[PDB]
Amino acid sequence: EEDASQLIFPKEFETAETLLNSEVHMLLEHRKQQNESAEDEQELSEVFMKTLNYTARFSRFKNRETIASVRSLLLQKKLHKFELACLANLCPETAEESKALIPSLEGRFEDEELQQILDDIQTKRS
């Protein structure tokens, strides 16, 4: 009974901090680099390969500088981690599109500043 429509989440997502697809891609590729140097190592699971390919293909941001800049930008606004991560990973192109994608977003913040934040996300992409 936990979803974005209600935002009534467990004590665990209350404690943990969410990550974006580009950060997860960076972390997984770093892990892959460390694993490859390892010798006589139970190789990485095929599931990890599939997840890595998925994360790399849909990575909206390409460098750690861009990721840090986006993180600071979104950290400035008063946004919960779940909405922040969902907007950053999907990256809606229009304010109406984001309103439709995340119902929780509508009715919370004004749309002129949402258009501004969305355009900032677009400009962050490279």
Added chain:
Amino acid sequence: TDQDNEIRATDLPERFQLRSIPVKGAEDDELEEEADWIYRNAFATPTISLQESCDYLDRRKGPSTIQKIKEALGFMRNQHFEVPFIAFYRKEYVEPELHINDLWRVWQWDEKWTQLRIRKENLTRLFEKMQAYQYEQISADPDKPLADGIRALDTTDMERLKDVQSMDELKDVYNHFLLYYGRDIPKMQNAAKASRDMYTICQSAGLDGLAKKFGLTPEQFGENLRDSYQRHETEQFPAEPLELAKDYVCSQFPTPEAVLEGARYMVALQIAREPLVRQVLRQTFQERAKLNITPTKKGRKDVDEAHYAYSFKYLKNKPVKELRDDQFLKICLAEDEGLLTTDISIDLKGVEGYGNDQTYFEEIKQFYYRDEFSHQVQEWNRQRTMAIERALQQFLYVQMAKELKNKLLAEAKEYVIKACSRKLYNWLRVAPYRPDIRVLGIAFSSARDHPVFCALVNGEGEVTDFLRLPHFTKRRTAWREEEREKKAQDIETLKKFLLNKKPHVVTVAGENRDAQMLIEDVKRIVHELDQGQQLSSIGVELVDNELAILYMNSKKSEAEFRDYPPVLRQAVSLARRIQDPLIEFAQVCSSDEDILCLKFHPLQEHVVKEELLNALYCEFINRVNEVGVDVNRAIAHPYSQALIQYVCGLGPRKGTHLLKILKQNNTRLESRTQLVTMCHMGPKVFMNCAGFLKIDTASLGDSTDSYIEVLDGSRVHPETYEWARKMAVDALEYDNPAGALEEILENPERLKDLDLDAFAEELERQGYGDKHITLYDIRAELSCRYKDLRTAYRSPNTEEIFNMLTKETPETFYIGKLIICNVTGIAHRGQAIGVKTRLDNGVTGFIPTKFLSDKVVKRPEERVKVGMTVHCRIMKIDIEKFSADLTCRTSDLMDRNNEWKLPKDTYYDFDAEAADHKQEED
């Protein structure tokens, strides 16, 4: 289900109805377009990779085949004639360019044309709807010029869609259409209904207007690429790229460099999506593409000499044209397992300094360049250079390389399917055994304790008696006395059985090398009977038991012979197979995909199952129709009923229904006419299958009060019965129709006196077309009714016997291969010559004393013992004696000089291989 009832009633070939895309009539114009399209894409289009012609019926084609293809299309599309009917009764229209197998290719490619035609129709509607909706804005305000973001969907785009000849070109048109009009279609849908990514960012920001100032349109640049020169001169603009960039600067693109960066993407993407650019590059990749392979960490240790990817472990600058047969499939399979990584590129890798090493990007850089030294031109030239650089590497190189790999992979899979078809055709082409019939099939198991079961089948393949020999596998020369006594008793038991039953031929399963020992025992027993002339000579044959094994496993054998053990059941199949391989193969291979259980090709499992299955069943249809099917024999012998489904124009459903009516009426198929009067067969279905169904008129006898047509037991189609009667009348030089036909069959020698050349004109004069081929076929049938065209049975040769018993092939058993053998003794001639070994496949190996070790060997006794396992390398192979010379020297195993290892690829990257293991040592 009700679908089967509809198919049973419909007067169309069952396979035609079962086709995914329903067969529809084709107009003359459509036939002409389809015939040319089929010929270009199916017979006149060489494969990129090296593929040898699989055609085996012939005992390439020019434009003349287009007319033949059109004739074949008309017979199928309009007249609903199946491929077997056309190849057997419409030869004059399709031959000699088109054969039965080629007609299948046309039939297969006929389906491809229809789907491509349908897609073009759908895209045409979409283009028209966009063309109309876009015009709505112009209609309201014609004065206002179209915005730079609103391209004109002119007839050039529409005609380009009409000129599409392939799916790949269709996608280019569709992708090009979406790039410019993809955004507005959802608005188009609402307007039509009511009336009844990174690209879009640059459009909203207005960078599209800037994108038009770079010098050329995507279509213009594509023309330059096509002609390989500056067909269109780039238009220069006064202001520098940065000066125009600041004009488009906004919140989305603050810096001028970002403005140019965003604009540059539009040019690169637009160039990539241009179908003309895509078409030109698509041709370029097919001409200069090269394959590079580098093993992964996993493959660096997994790909040893015995691995199937050893030959292409390292590849450097190997043109795709060099790939042959299923070489690419193995490369893809190795990649699928993570053993290596592939790369398709049009530029040489690590070949710096080679003459004319400029990459494809450099060659076309001058096709979008302005030759001026002005500073502004250089900036614009620099801006132009990066856009194409992005266009090639980011989009065109990636898409085209992927497209080529799919094209290359499909060709490799097609070869594998072609190989599978060849194997099945050879098995089905073997004619029934003809003694120089009653068959005694003998089968045995690899285990020593297992007995030997002999199954006797009469002429119709019905089991009449069987023999069990508990100790037939034992050697009559065994030193132990009881074994000889046990072996001796079984010999006489078979001797008495042979004397009474008098089988015409004895077939022994080629389970293993022990089959040879059984052959000698059976032959010796027959020799004793023939020595005293108490019994005629009985043929002894060795038959592969792969099909027999499948029947032993198949649950169908259980129903037929519940009490017969598996070894005895396979004995029946071996005896049945020699009697008629086609019947056995069809009966053994049921609708449960049991055919795939047979080993056609090593990589037959890596190809499309539906494509492989369709090709295999085509061989059955071709062979079954050629041989013919006897309905009366099937009714009396249910096991032979599996041939009716393969009959032309019947299929599994109608074929099963045909037996049901005949068995329901408790009558026989006395004449072909009964298929319509009694079985209620449609005229179209009758046309396809009437000539391929045989009735044994002589077997009917006087019990059949109704009229019996002698021609019903011949390939002559009912439509040409009057022609056959006329031919018989002319042969005897009469001056009745039922008398000459009967007499000529008894003495057909008078047929040669006929002048069939003259008879052709008379038919042509009265409007029957060219029938010279048909007339010759009619004359041949009169000489011999339903003469078997299958290849005469012959005993397996030495090469086949070695493969049959050892289950080994040259690819898997070759000189220099590393094998494992067990020592069984020391070869003597005190004095010794080497060590004798036995392989797991039954081959007896021999290790000479000199090859027994790197250093000199004094006595072989201490080096190896009986039962010891020694790793050895094959030096020579003696298939005739199932012997092979072996060496176990440590230096030989190491093979530092690579003398024993299999040949590597011509473009093998030895430099990469040397470096890889060199870094490993460090």
Added chain:
Amino acid sequence: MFYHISLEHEILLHPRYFGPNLLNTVKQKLFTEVEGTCTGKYGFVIAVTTIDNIGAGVIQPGRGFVLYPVKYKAIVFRPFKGEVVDAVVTQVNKVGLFTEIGPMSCFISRHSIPSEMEFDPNSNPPCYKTMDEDIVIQQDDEIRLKIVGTRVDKNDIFAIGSLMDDYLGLV
């Protein structure tokens, strides 16, 4: 949805490894243990980033082994009902579409597809299409789907998705 959470796991150690490299074999076993697993409470576990601390292991009487409580920070991918995510089409047939979100696989039912889409068995690549053919989804396409259900199978949760809402389609 990918997540970064700290979890705890107790690893048992045979006395064979009570040597200088004990702490290393502890983390090696943790990595081999947790990585690749899936759980309903925490979803898939993608990778182990760091190890916060290794508690003092305990000697279990009679048994030779020693147990260590290893608190560790890991990446987990947990989907939710009513969540819009990107997915990759991997196989397309007449019954419907099959997509993948990271490790998870999804199947889109006909009732989750907009009425404009219609099944087409005649096409060579089976696909979902409408008469206008404005949007075409085929194998390897990127789609945006709404998760409608969660079902846990053999310690492997599988989800069913949907694209029935507005603006969910190939972009």
